[PDB]
Amino acid sequence: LCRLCPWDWTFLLGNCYFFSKSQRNWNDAVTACKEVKAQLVIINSDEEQTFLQQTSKAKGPTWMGLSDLKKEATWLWVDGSTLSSRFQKYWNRGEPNNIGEEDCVEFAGDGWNDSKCELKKFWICKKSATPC
């Protein structure tokens, strides 16, 4: 009886993902994920980014665990790690913009936008799986 991820979480490449059914502001989304020992999703591979971008298209704009709330124009994941050069290609054309006003990052369409953190959007949690 191999259970890769908890009930209603999805396994992808050694991690477990939870796709919210409701919409919350960015900070509340962060908190929701911490409630289940997880983090508002931190993207770390292209296959992961591809899967979360597709899934998120079916619901609508969706938060990820990325923001420049600490220092404008510097984007940090919720675990404090820096956004790598190779991931900057995921930004949509024209993003990030409205710097200092739109401080949190969302999947929008086929890439990332920065958006106003107070907006309510879907969100995704990620934590490690338990292998079999």
Q: Are strands 111-115 and 10-12 parallel, antiparallel or unpaired?
A: unpaired
Could you check whether the bond before residue 96 is cis, i.e. omega within 30 degrees of 0? yes
43 is in an annotated binding site: no
What is the x/- site pattern for Ca ion, positions 87-106, by CB under 5 A? ----------x----x----
Q: Which pair of structure tokens corresponds to residue 8? A: 């209603």
Among 3, 34, 81, 110, binds its own copies (CB under 8 A): 110
Residue numbers in the known binding site for Ca(2+) are 95, 97, 99, 102, 113-114
Please report, in range form, the residues annotated as the binding site.
95, 97, 99, 102, 113-114
Instruction: Please give the residue ranges that form the binding site for its own copies (CB under 8 A).
Output: 73-74, 85-86, 88-97, 99, 110-111
